[PDB]
Amino acid sequence: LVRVRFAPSPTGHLHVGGARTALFNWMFARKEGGKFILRIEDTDTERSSREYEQQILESLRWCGLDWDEGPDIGGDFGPYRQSERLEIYREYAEKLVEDKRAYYVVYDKEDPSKELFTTYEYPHEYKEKGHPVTIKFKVLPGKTSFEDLLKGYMEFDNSTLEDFIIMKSNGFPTYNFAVVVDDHLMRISHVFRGEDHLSNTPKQLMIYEAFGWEAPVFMHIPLILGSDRTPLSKRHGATSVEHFRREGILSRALMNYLALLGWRVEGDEIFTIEEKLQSFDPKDISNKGVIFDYQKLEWVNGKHMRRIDLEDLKREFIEWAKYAGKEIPSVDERYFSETLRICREKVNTLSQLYDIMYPFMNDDYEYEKDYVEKFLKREEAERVLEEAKKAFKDLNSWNMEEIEKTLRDLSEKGLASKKVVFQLIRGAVTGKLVTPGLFETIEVLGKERTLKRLERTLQFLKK
């Protein structure tokens, strides 16, 4: 009888703040074997959409969040749109009017900012004309409390609160009413949402017992925030899952973070969502707001790029290119595997991984100013690039140890300083001053590609 869901809202895209709350119900529904449902909350006709109401599922899907019921697929307890159900929220909203719980509020047409009176009677002689009309829920005295699964005994004073509209003039449910209705008809066992709703729960409870139903289990976990410590959205830089996927951040690496920022770890903070099911701590999560951190995220991501199998990585890297603009060249899979096995221990993102292996692939790579302005332009940099092609020319064996021999046997030949000899060969074959092990670089780049890049630099030296 376990059925937890996630009620999104079509408004641009989804960020880590929302995804994290989604990841929870996902795992939970899996640890207990319950059903996970997807319910798009688009009751706000003003900010309604479809595009932004689609980019959400794709991302979640990319996050590895599979859902049982949803609008994208089938679903008996549907429809799954807080808009394609204006036939249900109707009769129910009118049933509350019976028990004197909901009264038709008649508004003034002359001014869209004036109220007339209160009445349970149906204002046919007003709505038919033009006078906007809604439906409010009368709040009676008392204390509407509940047992939060994280906050505990949450007691509230209905007195401090009052009649709140539950039906927009355009015959559209607001939210507190839309939730209660779909949180019962869809038979939801547990409701695990953010924390900004912890204040709305009371308003909802009064609706449950109103219809004579039985509210489910409510729990409100911390909220991922930004720098100013405000509820994460988009104004906090770029915390949209869509963004990360662009920058080249793995999925398993990001997931391992959301379940690390707020939700703790029973050992090594580095892991995956799989090996964390049976060891899921529904309550042992977080209790306070958690600021998002790119640095910790990128750090965690970079590591996953080293633990996972070599094959696993390349696959994801391939898919990334298709997502982003510029694509990958055409090279030997075994050669690509090597260069991809040498540059993976330097970059912490797929973007940085591509912008570093480019020289290993394409040969029309440029030369960063640093290299030229610092070492290359040095009058005593050409003579060093001379023996660089000579010694190597003779080298019958082209491996690390061997290539390692030549290099060191140069910096100590009066030719030039230690680093000077290394940075010249480096940028000569990579075009950058920051690349993988020079012993690996010169190695993986075979013997031919090397000599060419040595010549190239030479011919260019002449400004």
Place this chain on the structure above:
RNA sequence: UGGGAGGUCGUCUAACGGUAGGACGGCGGACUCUGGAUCCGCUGGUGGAGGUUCGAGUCCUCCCCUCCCAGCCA
């Protein structure tokens, strides 16, 4: 202000009432080469006050701040 929720290094997080520790960042070594990366190291916090105590992040009280609900937003 009304009502809720929460405060430990810059950030995420440990501490039977009894050592404020561990990580990311940052700064520094090392890697008989580069450094985003790799091993370690290094400072850095109890939101601020009174009191109960041999002693309090931990217990009581006052003060301060932060986020949410006080929309025909969700």
